[PDB]
């Protein structure tokens, strides 16, 4: 009741701050000609991410540029408005920080601190797999991040190595929040990425924050094995495996790791760790985490097992054709994005 009461008090203040920012979001805190473009870091079906330099300060940022017309075409208005509203309201060491946002006739812009270490995904595929201490270090950060997000009644719903950055201290930054939803009870949308979907998302019953603990199990498995627990040529075949209740482990997994994963990759949501009476403490007190100093992880005082090569450098991102950023003379989709 010292450590536990400190966390309760911390989370109560955190919720008060979150709700104030959620109710009165920041808007229009920069403009495009404050920035020079350097390089395209990523492309998607309705936007791009660009490395940019702030002209006055010289600071580097990742600028997410979303084409309003394409957002409307692909039915992503609510997700995009939600992502920005969440990002400007949350505050936690392992969440990316929104520095500026604004819009113009054509685009929405979210400007975030640049993290040159890139995605966990690339590092994992390059090295093959992480040792269990390395995986555990990242897993502990996700456990704490979900403890925070769930205390705000947010379900995260898109955990995967693609959405985790590794910063220059070797710690994680969670990137994407469009799918994050306020859920005190249950929700029903089929959304996420096939390999990481909990059975109850596939099966069309309502679901709750316990899906994030299932996804943690998938992430830990993929980090430690180099491949996810459920894979196949086509998503429908992946879904059949997920709901089956059967999983196999590499022979190099420790006994403690297998026991944790059997309890996270638990199809019966009423038996799944994270979702029992003692909540996240069943995970934090599990034998696999016995060596984890949870407070030291939160304070970023643990020496990271891996620090990306320090080189403005973009070597941890792929190369893309550089295309114009065109801003129309006509305002597009103004009413739809009024709150951005």
């Amino acid at each position: 009741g010292s450590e536990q009461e400190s966390v309760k008090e911390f989370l109560a203040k955190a919720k008060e701050e979150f709700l104030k920012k959620w109710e009165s979001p920041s808007q229009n805190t920069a403009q495009l000609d404050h920035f020079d473009r350097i390089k395209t870091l990523g492309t998607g079906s309705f936007g791009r991410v660009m490395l940019v330099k702030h002209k006055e300060t010289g600071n580097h940022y990742a600028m997410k540029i979303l084409d309003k017309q394409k957002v409307v075409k692909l039915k992503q208005i609510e997700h995009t408005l939600n992502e920005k509203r969440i990002l400007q309201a949350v505050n936690f060491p392992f969440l990316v920080k929104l520095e500026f946002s604004f819009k113009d006739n054509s685009n929405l812009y979210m400007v975030m601190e640049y993290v040159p270490g890139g995605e966990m995904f690339s590092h994992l595929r390059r090295i093959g797999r992480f040792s269990e201490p390395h995986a555990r270090f990242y897993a502990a950060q996700i456990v704490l991040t979900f403890e925070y997000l769930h205390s705000l009644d947010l379900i995260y719903r898109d955990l995967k190595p693609e959405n985790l950055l590794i910063d220059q201290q070797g710690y994680i930054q969670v990137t994407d929040f469009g799918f994050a939803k306020r859920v005190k009870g249950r929700t029903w949308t089929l959304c996420g990425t096939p390999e990481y979907l909990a059975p109850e998302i596939i099966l069309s019953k309502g679901y709750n924050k316990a899906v994030d603990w299932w996804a943690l199990g998938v992430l830990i498995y993929e980090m430690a094995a180099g491949y996810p627990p459920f894979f196949a040529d086509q998503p429908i075949q992946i879904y059949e495996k997920i709901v089956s209740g059967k999983v196999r482990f590499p022979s190099h997994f420790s006994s403690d790791l297998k026991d944790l994963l059997r309890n996270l990759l638990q199809v019966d949501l009423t038996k799944r760790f994270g979702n029992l009476k003692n909540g996240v403490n069943d995970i934090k007190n599990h034998k696999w985490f016995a060596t984890t100093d949870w407070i030291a992880i939160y304070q970023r005082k643990v020496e990271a097992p891996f620090i990306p090569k320090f080189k403005g450098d973009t070597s941890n991102f792929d190369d893309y054709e550089e295309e114009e950023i065109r801003v129309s003379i006509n305002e597009k989709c103004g009413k739809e994005f009024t709150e951005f």
């Binding site: 959304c191 990425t193 390999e195």
Partner: peptide, 18 residues
């Protein structure tokens, strides 16, 4: 091996949301 089956699945690159 299971790894070989993972490679054969074709889903070794970045994965999109559904």
């Amino acid at each position: 091996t299971t790894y070989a089956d993972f490679i054969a699945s074709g889903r070794t690159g970045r994965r999109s949301a559904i």
